[PDB]
């Protein structure tokens, strides 16, 4: 039966928040594992308003840091606005001073509330333009202001890059690349070398998938990745470049206002030759989602097997994100969904050996899938989908894995966040190969993405714990606390608790200290 | 985890059988249930070549009709062969004389009823696909009469799955060449059988008329929805080229098989009709491709139809898998052929009844227990996605059968289905169609046929009764075959009642009560 939300306490994860002077001693129930040492870092939103003037959506308010340190069975949790423009000018001009996603300032975003990175020895803030900003890991401090476009030609690039177990960067951004025409490069930042120069400058565009559209690229939040293969999917969501510079230089757009929705395109999928730094041209073809998030991809036989977070339907899910919407009551929060885009998770598997022979056949011959290819007479190769997980609004999203030793890689588990009509009530545990799930929630709380951290001794793919910040308002109950839960089955292990609210965090890294 | 058929007992589904002079007393194990009273009738191919000719494709075989009769505990089972055209002139010819559905006869539409059996009135018929359809006793098996179904009215063939209401009356589909220079599909009705006692055939009539996607190449209709509001048609992409039945079978001889092709970009066309208005509804529905036989139920859910479909992923046409050759191969080699074969899946399609043009872009599904989408686009298309309900590799959940007298058209929560592996029936499976839990009833080297459901008297839940199905079961010192009855609550034996000669494949059926 379907969990119920009446309280109403989700609003408290859209509420500003001050930051702290310095770390905070958490008050710990049960037994943190002594094997746990090191910092989980997230980014959120934390500043809902500057003075009188509102933020509107979900991904603008300002860039916050969080961090929860363990040490011994001892937590401290700590937070800092990071000092970007977006932020360092607001404070000084007390107002919107700088466009957001979805707020007009009455100058692109460097607003990086929404996940941290390593580049070399150095961590990176981001959001999904081309400035990053560099972070001090230990006090939250910021140190610099970094745009990508000094190094390589991309307008932007997505708060989810790959970081191979070297040390190695890739990433995805659109661009004008090709001539006359929008392309997508993949750019990659090496590992730091005994000259200990800044690895960034030494970026390069390693290559360029080609765009549906001449003049719209799609939005592109990650990508997939494995040893020798990139995989992107091609979404029917749009950015039409002619709607902003069309209002930035007439009348006052945002980036949402860009966005529009193909109707008849549905999705196309593309993959590269890592290695050979070479675009293979097979038209994978399916039919119309949104995504934000691949789970794992990995190779398999000569097929690629794609698991995905995905909405049904080409209407861009980004419009049911507002504060005001999610802010609502909540019988009014599910009739904002109803007509929502829905949420599954799929599983696609890609030929790599296309044979003409087998014109009009399926072309998936794997033992352990449902998943289809086939091959038309025009060349495309359309694509049916193996379910994994379907829920009726229920999304798992915010996916992760045991990213250090099984990202790129055959795999059996993932761990997500459960949206309940969009509001993050659950923790799950899935499964991607009998379909099992484990799932911990507890009413009146909210959590964020879960992350795991391996013991470091496993052999095994779920040995260790998942870490998740949770918002549990009430009368007589500590606003937050972070929240440890054994690996194998989502049971609870430990949990921190602090005594002040914690806002939405979107994403993160446990740094092993 | 994977179960293999090494010993490869499922060749005895195609090999051919003698009829019986008369019933056999069938040997019970378990307890037959004693409120079951009634005939288990079902149909299949039990004669597979004539002399040294071979019938090549699953669905040549001639007609058999088959009995299971039950009474106070005790069961006997009889079949004869229907006394089709087909038949009869095989017989008297010594060799092949009718072309079949994927075997040329060498030197006249087919009459072999090897698919099912359904009431008219108070008659009976067994039927194949084509217009012609045989009277036959279910008391004796004899045949009665050959119906010519274009004496009545204008299809040119129609589905061996019928749909049947409460108080008598028929509905079926079939293709014909209605609207001017164009090819359509025709749903027939026909009445109860009235005061007069006339035949109710001789009342058939066409009710409405779905459009074709192609002037002139209709899909291939296996089965169709019915509701008490609606009737629910699924165009899919494998279609008849007509032009190349008429062409090839003057030049040396084709058969039916070689005149269908797979159309790679429309997709799957769904339609639907105002039953009791009579008339079409110009909703375009429109899916990715697929292959489908089997509709499992249809019902209506405040502004929406939920259609429950048996699918195949793909455009290829299934029936291709299913030569003789190829499924009485050894087990690896049967496993290798059905490599590239399109994949099985159980689909929740919703259907939106009520289109407003303001929700232009959006999910138009707003039921609150399915993840099924209905899309409204510009161009007036309604793109649907599915809710998946069941999905196995190379595991299909085919031959699906409901509660049909209390749940057909209605709200329900179960179906039964015939589990097959890599093409081979290998188990019996139940599903919960609102949780999607799961029951299995197998057994190694047994091979079971279509389940039926019937309900106990006194029954208070939809799923209060049993299911049938025939088994074959051959191997050393093993009844060849035996009628299995499962509890239908949870797919537990009952009973069986067992017999010393083969079975081969039947495919429907029905259950008379007495
Ligand atoms: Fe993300
Ligand atoms: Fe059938």
Redesign the interface.
């Known amino acids: 039966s379907?969990v119920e939300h009446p309280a109403g306490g989700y609003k408290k994860l859209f509420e500003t928040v001050e930051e702290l002077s310095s770390p905070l001693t958490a008050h710990v129930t049960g037994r943190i594992p002594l094997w746990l040492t090191g910092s989980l870092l997230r980014c959120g939103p934390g500043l809902f308003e500057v003075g009188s003037e509102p933020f509107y959506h979900l991904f603008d308010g300002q860039a916050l840091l969080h961090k929860f340190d363990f040490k011994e069975g001892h937590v401290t949790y700590h937070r800092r606005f990071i000092r970007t423009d977006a932020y360092v000018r607001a404070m000084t001009e007390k107002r919107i001073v700088i466009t957001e996603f979805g707020t007009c300032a009455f100058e692109v975003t460097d607003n990086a509330l929404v996940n941290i990175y390593p580049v070399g020895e150095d961590y990176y803030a981001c959001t999904e333009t081309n400035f990053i900003t560099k972070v001090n890991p230990e006090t939250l401090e910021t140190i610099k202001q970094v745009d990508l476009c000094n190094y390589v030609s991309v307008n932007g690039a997505t708060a989810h890059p790959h970081i191979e177990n070297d040390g190695t960067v890739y990433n995805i951004g659109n661009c004008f690349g090709k001539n006359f025409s929008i392309a997508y490069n993949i750019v990659k930042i090496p590992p730091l070398q005994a000259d200990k120069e800044d690895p960034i400058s030494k970026s390069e565009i390693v290559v360029q998938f080609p765009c549906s559209d001449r003049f719209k690229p799609s939005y592109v939040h990650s990508f997939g990745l494995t040893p020798n293969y990139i995989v992107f999917v091609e979404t029917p969501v749009k950015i039409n470049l002619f709607k902003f510079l069309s209002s930035w230089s007439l009348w006052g757009a945002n980036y949402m206002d860009c966005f529009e929705?193909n109707?008849?395109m549905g999705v196309w999928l593309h993959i590269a030759d890592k290695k050979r730094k070479k675009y293979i041209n097979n038209k994978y073809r399916?039919?119309?989602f949104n995504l934000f998030h691949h789970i794992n991809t990995y190779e398999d036989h000569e097929f690629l097997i794609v698991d995905l977070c995905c909405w049904?339907?080409?209407?861009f899910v980004y419009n049911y994100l507002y504060l005001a919407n999610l802010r609502e009551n909540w019988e009014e929060v599910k009739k904002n969904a109803?007509?929502?885009?829905?949420?599954?998770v799929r599983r696609y598997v890609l030929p790599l050996n296309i044979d003409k022979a087998?014109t009009?056949?399926?072309?998936?011959?794997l033992?352990?899938?449902?998943?289809?290819a086939?091959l038309?007479?025009?060349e495309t190769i359309?694509l049916?989908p193996?379910?994994l997980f379907?829920?009726?609004r229920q999304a798992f999203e915010f996916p992760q894995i045991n990213y250090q030793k099984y990202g790129g890689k055959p795999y059996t588990y993932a761990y997500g966040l459960g949206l309940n009509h969009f509001v993050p009530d659950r923790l799950c545990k899935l499964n991607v190969k009998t379909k099992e799930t484990w799932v911990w929630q507890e009413p009146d709380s909210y959590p964020s993405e879960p992350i795991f951290v391996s013991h470091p001794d496993a052999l095994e793919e779920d040995d260790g714990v998942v870490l998740s910040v949770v918002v549990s308002p009430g009368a007589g109950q500590k606003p937050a606390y972070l929240l440890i839960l054994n690996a194998k089955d989502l049971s609870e292990v430990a949990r921190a608790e602090v005594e002040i609210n914690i806002p939405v965090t979107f994403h993160g890294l446990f740094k092993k200290s």
């Open positions: 379907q929705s109707e008849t399916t039919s119309p049904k339907g080409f209407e109803r007509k929502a885009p829905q949420p599954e087998d009009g056949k399926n072309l998936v011959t033992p352990n899938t449902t998943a289809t086939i038309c007479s025009d359309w049916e193996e379910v379907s829920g009726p």
